[PDB]
Design a protein around this nucleic acid. Structure first.
Ligand SMILES: [Mg+2]
Lengths: 360, 227, 363, 51
DNA sequence: AGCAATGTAATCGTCTATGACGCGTCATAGACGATTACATTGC
């Protein structure tokens, strides 16, 4: 591909996640630092200038989501710090971080792990806790006075009360709640009844088999699911539940040589992004199920020489860094040559670098 | 065979101790509740009253930590056989009797006066006469015994009929020996420390009524229910 | 009897005063060996006099360690009932411990807590009871826990130094000096903090099972260790090493498996909370972390999944470690906090029983 | 003494709650306490009714 | 195995609702939240 702007030593803890809504490249990180990287950057300048940081929590941030709508210019940011809470933020423009706690006080009693916003096409979000419950809210902006009303009481099917790792929302009505050991439950929006809940088929021999991520495909029929086989990562698709194969590198069959950490579907469902801890990215055609290309990740690719982080705190050489997340920026979101017609990609490596990429 | 009769108290709408003559603690046999019935009756009446008598068994067994043996009519009488469970023969021998011989020089010692069956019976009168009406004679029967246990027969016989003394001892009887074994170190404080657990008046349920009452339920105290 | 007595004493006030028997309060609290023994011997005697002669209820009163009035009496003077009132066993345990301490004090030879518990198992039951009541007694007389009342912990941590001379003053009042031998896998019996140690790459191992493989292989690293959670004598030994013979050693490191328990053990080794006497800030943390087992799993470890209790412990260990400290980036507890952060989100522990390789060797 | 005072009568003079008597269960306020001379006259009337 | 950690239950203080007395005020008690002890976990 084409290696566009990046930023090394962005944060200092671990930068765990990234999200984007055209204007922004919001990315929570380790030591509770939301550092919104304003997306519309010209010339070649690194995005630090547009880096409008704001201290959030001392505990630590893993996930981050953000929803920009077209009303009024409402745009919220949702983080789920390690201590178990829902930190929301009104992002409005030098942006000001104005915290509106639109939740209640009797609900902050358990640790919510991941969340996903569902746009109105009726804005919703789901944020499952570390007990198993798949909580569902409903947004009501109205005059600034939002109220987030709870409706979801989707209990944990697999026993007992294990780690609800992954979260998703279908375009129409479906919610895939991946668990710590297989059992990616499928539920419905307005009935609160779990539909067909399958398991990872290749579960032979007692070993770790988790669900690192689940992500639906645009129109809402595909159910590509990542998992972890012992010390190897794979990909398993479904239709919204039947097993229809498994992505694998040419050579058991594995997509990567390590854990598949995050996925992403493009605008209309032609490509997949397999973010692996091995140190590279593999792109797959959904219909055909071959790999399109391989994208190596290197620490020296950082444009600023002082921002290169090739040695860890302890003293080894993490030259090939893990990739905690990879996200897609839709048609016309970036600024630059061919930005309107080309889709864009973004990744956050383990060497504390957030790197964007342009379609080519 | 000392005999005590309570003043005749009847509200409507005789303890026998087989001990020598005398500060002394009383204990039950090893005791009977035996009331006669008359209408100034064994026929018909008695047959269900017996069962109503058996209705008290919960209070006798779940509450007071006793154990029944038999309920068999003796002519015109109901036997409510009651053997002690907290203070068995071995326990009485170990506590008050065995250290009663070695340490004769020690004073402040209690004399045992065994308690036998008590029979304070009052024949109530009802307008019906020949036939009998029920479902209010149940509270009528409960009231007398509830009043008798709470008020009089518990401030001077704690060990034989009290509710919150026997339970306290059972809670503290197991650890009663090391305390004496680590204070005067032979055994001598053991025939008295049992006469001090029973000789406190703060443990009576009368005190428990008028206190702050922090723990919400205890001592249901509802006896002789309907069959 | 309340019948015929209620007319003398009226209303709920002062009737509880009448029914409550007067309590002859006895102060266990408020010092050399003779001074310590005098109070203990007087206490038992004056408590026994009330029971034997005056038939007056005793009430053992004392002030325990603050986190303060507390009372244990006989015969449950307490009003109504409190399910907690199954506590005369604790009073008997306290009395028996006082008797045993007073009896074994003049003998002049320290006896272990385990020996005391084994002597009378029926009443003491779990050794935690004896351990807690010993500390209560020590604090109640203002006796310093460092200067033990002739009662010592049973000894835990073993060493594999390839000398380690220990010197001490032995009471009986007299002072005597001794020398204790080492050089093979064994234990250093005891030395007070007033006593000091000498010496003739330290590797801490917390599991003690992986320890007895590295002792066999040995591929001159004096190999001081402990067990799961360190005993008091082990931290005392490490502090004495750093305080008298710090120069000779270099780069001592802990080595714990990457569960929340392992990092908690390393923390309890390295950094303690508000109350601290011996902390051994010397030690460095180079333990086998999450990013030291996954990055080697290509050329193997069983791995595991988080339990509900493990996650709760690791999250609690994140609230504390950084509550007052301003910044994660620069802090003495940066590595532990970031490691626990990774382990919480990776959702997999990494026990160390089979990865044992040349990691222990520095370079 | 052998007066034998009723449980009912005991509460009413002293500190009453009328709620604590529920779990304690001493409450049965139907028979009521009967004074000795009034008891004698009452039982005489009851006996005279029978004829 | 000496020394930890935490979850849970029990107790204690405080707030508020209701009843009683001389429409407002005071007393009482029931319910809620906070604090601590015990043990069931764990190397
Ligand atoms: Mg372990």
């Amino acid at each position: 591909f084409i290696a566009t702007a990046n930023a090394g030593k962005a944060h200092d803890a671990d930068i765990f996640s990234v999200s984007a809504c055209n204007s922004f490249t919001v990315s929570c990180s380790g030591d509770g630092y939301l550092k919104v990287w304003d997306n519309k950057l010209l010339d070649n300048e690194n995005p630090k200038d547009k880096s409008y940081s704001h201290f959030v929590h001392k505990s630590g941030l893993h996930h981050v989501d953000v929803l920009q709508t077209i009303e009024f210019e409402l745009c919220l940011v949702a983080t789920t710090s390690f201590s178990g809470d829902l930190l929301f933020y009104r992002i409005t423009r030098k942006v000001i971080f104005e915290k509106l706690d639109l939740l209640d006080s009797d609900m902050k009693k358990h640790s919510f792990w991941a969340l996903k916003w569902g746009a109105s096409n009726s804005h919703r979000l789901v944020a499952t806790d570390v007990k198993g419950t798949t909580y569902i809210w409903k947004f009501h902006p109205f005059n600034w006075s939002p109220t987030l009303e709870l409706q979801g009481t989707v209990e944990s099917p697999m026993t007992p009360s294990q780690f609800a790792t992954s979260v998703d929302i279908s375009e129409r009505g479906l919610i895939a709640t991946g668990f710590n050991n297989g059992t990616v439950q499928i539920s419905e929006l307005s009935t609160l009844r779990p539909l067909y809940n399958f398991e990872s088929q290749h579960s032979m021999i007692n070993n770790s088999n988790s669900i690192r991520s689940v992500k639906f495909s645009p129109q809402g029929s595909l159910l590509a699911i990542a998992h972890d086989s012992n010390s190897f990562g794979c990909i398993t698709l479904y239709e919204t539940g039947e097993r229809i194969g498994s992505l694998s590198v040419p050579t058991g069959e594995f997509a990567h040589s390590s854990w598949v950490m995050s996925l992403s579907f493009n605008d209309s469902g032609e490509t997949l992004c397999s973010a692996g801890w091995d140190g590279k990215l593999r792109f797959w055609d959904v219909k055909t199920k071959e790999r399109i290309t391989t994208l190596n990740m290197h620490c020296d690719d950082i444009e600023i020489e002082e921002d290169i982080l090739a040695v860890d705190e302890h003293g080894d050489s993490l030259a090939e860094p893990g990739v905690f997340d990879v996200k897609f920026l839709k048609k016309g979101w970036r600024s630059g040559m061919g930005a309107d017609l080309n889709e864009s990609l973004c990744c956050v490596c383990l060497d504390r670098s957030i790197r964007w990429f342009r379609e080519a | 065979a000392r005999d005590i009769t309570f003043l005749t108290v009847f509200l409507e709408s005789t303890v026998r101790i087989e001990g020598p003559e005398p500060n002394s603690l009383y204990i039950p046999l090893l005791l009977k509740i035996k009331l006669n019935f008359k209408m100034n009756e064994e026929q018909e009446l008695f047959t269900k009253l017996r069962e109503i008598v058996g209705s008290s068994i919960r209070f006798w067994e779940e509450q007071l930590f006793y154990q029944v043996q038999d309920v068999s009519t003796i002519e015109n009488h109901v036997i409510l056989s009651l053997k002690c469970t907290i203070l068995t023969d071995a326990q009485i021998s170990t506590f008050i009797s065995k250290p009663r011989e070695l340490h004769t020089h020690a004073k402040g010692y209690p004399e045992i006066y065994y308690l036998s069956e008590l029979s304070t019976t009052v024949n109530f009168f009802s307008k019906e006469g020949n036939y009998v009406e029920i479902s209010h004679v149940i509270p009528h029967f409960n009231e007398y015994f509830s009043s008798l246990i709470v008020s009089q027969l518990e401030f001077e016989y704690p060990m034989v009929f009290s509710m919150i003394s026997r339970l306290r001892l059972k809670w503290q009887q197991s650890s009663l020996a090391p305390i004496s074994y680590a204070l005067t170190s032979n055994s001598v404080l053991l025939p008295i420390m049992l006469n001090m657990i029973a000789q406190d008046k703060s443990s009576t349920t009368a005190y428990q009524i008028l206190c702050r009452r922090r723990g919400p339920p205890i001592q249901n105290f509802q006896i002789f229910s309907i069959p | 009897a309340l019948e015929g007595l209620r007319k003398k004493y009226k209303t709920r006030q002062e009737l509880v005063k009448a029914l409550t028997p007067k309590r002859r309060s006895i102060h266990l609290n408020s010092c050399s060996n003779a001074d310590v023994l005098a109070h203990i011997k007087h206490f038992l005697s004056l408590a026994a006099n009330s029971l034997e002669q005056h038939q007056q209820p005793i009430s053992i009163v004392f002030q325990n360690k603050k986190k303060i009035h507390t009372t244990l009496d006989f015969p449950l003077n307490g009003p109504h009932l409190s399910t907690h009132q199954f506590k005369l066993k604790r009073c008997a345990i306290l009395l028996n411990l006082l008797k045993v301490v007073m009896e074994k004090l003049p003998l002049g030879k320290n006896t272990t807590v385990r020996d005391i518990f084994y002597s009378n198992v029926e009443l003491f039951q779990r050794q935690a009871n004896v351990v807690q009541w010993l500390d209560v007694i020590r604090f109640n007389f203002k006796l310093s826990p460092r200067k033990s009342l002739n009662i010592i912990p049973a000894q835990k941590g073993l060493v594999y130094s390839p000398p380690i001379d220990i010197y001490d003053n032995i009471l009986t009042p007299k002072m005597q000096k001794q020398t204790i031998f080492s050089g093979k896998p064994c234990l250093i019996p005891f030395f007070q903090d007033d006593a000091v140690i000498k010496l003739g790459n330290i590797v801490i191992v917390e599991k003690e099972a992986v320890f007895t493989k590295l002792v066999n292989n040995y591929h001159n690293t004096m190999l001081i260790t402990g067990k799961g959670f360190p005993d008091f004598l082990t931290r005392l030994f490490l502090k004495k090493l750093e305080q008298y013979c710090s120069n000779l050693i270099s780069d001592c490191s802990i080595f714990t498996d990457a569960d929340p328990y392992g990092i908690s053990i390393a923390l309890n080794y390295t950094h303690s909370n508000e109350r601290n006497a011996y902390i051994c800030t010397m030690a460095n943390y180079k333990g086998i972390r999450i990013t030291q087992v996954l990055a080697q799993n290509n050329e193997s470890i069983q791995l595991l999944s988080l339990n509900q209790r493990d996650y709760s412990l690791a999250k609690n260990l994140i609230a504390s470690l950084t509550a007052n400290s301003w910044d994660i980036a620069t802090s003495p507890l940066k590595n532990v906090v970031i490691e626990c952060q990774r382990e919480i989100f990776f959702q997999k522990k990494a026990e160390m029983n089979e990865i044992d390789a040349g990691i222990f060797k520095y370079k | 003494t052998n007066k034998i005072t009723c449980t009912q009568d005991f509460l009413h003079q002293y500190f009453v709650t009328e709620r604590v008597s529920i779990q304690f269960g001493l409450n049965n306020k139907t028979v009521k306490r009967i004074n000795k001379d009034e008891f004698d006259k009452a039982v005489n009337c009851i006996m005279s009714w029978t004829n």
